[PDB]
Copies of this chain bind each other. A is one copy, B any other.
Amino acid sequence: MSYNLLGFLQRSSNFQCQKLLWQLNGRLEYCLKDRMNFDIPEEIKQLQQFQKEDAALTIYEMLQNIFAIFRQDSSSTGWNETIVENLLANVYHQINHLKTVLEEKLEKEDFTRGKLMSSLHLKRYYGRILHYLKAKEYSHCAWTIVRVEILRNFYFINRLTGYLRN
């Protein structure tokens, strides 16, 4: 599969993922009190030079984590859990999809000195989100704040998707 097909398949699932996220809530002003900056790594937003493999490996890791975030207990939200499952199934498919394509591309390359952009700061960034969730005892507001941050993640993954050009 060319990078172009993967990139389109990504833009396409992101959009689907974002759509599902937008079918869970009804704005909560009260929750603005739990507002917290998680500081997505600066390179995810501003780095201008991404090689096809790096952007790909980066989105791969972001997805893996978004999956893990949403795998937590959202019961306190009252969200339609069906939609949550769709969101999860969708991301899971993108992850395994990306995995197979990277496996093919990377097979014969000089290592890849992989996630130079990814690993490092993404792991810590997501740790904050998780720690935040646990600290707030998975409250409905905590989920409202995270959901907004997750949507924000998707906004940047779309930016990253444009470096997947053939």
Q: In the assembly, what is the distance between CA of A2 and CA of B54, in Å? A: 10
The answer to whether A43 and B113 have CB atoms under 8 Å apart is no
Q: How many copies of the shown chain assemble into the complex?
A: 2
The answer to whether B1 and A113 have CB atoms under 8 Å apart is yes
CB distance from A139 to the nearest CB of B (A): 31
Of the residues B9, B46, B51, B113, contact of A8 by C-beta under 8 Å: B46
For residue A40, CB closer than 8 A to chain B, the reply is: no
Q: In the assembly, what is the distance between CA of A153 and CA of B6, in Å? A: 23
Interfacial chain B residues near A54, Cβ < 8 Å: 5
Q: In the assembly, what is the distance between CA of A4 and CA of B55, in Å? A: 13
**Residues of A112-151 whose CB lies within 8 A of B:** 113, 116-117
Of all chain B residues, which has the CB nearest A1? Answer: B113
Interfacial chain B residues near A2, Cβ < 8 Å: 113, 116
For A4-30 the 0/1 string (1 means CB < 8 A from B) is: 110011001000000000000000000
The answer to whether B104 and A5 have CB atoms under 8 Å apart is no
Using A2-B113, A113-B2 as known contacts, say yes or no to A8 and B43 having CB atoms under 8 A apart.
Answer: yes
For residue A42, CB closer than 8 A to chain B, the reply is: yes
For residue A37, CB closer than 8 A to chain B, the reply is: no
For residue A49, CB closer than 8 A to chain B, the reply is: yes
Q: In the assembly, what is the distance between CA of A51 and CA of B1, in Å? A: 9
Sample of 4 more A-B contacts, CB < 8 Å, known A4-B49, A5-B47: A1-B51, A2-B116, A8-B43, A9-B43
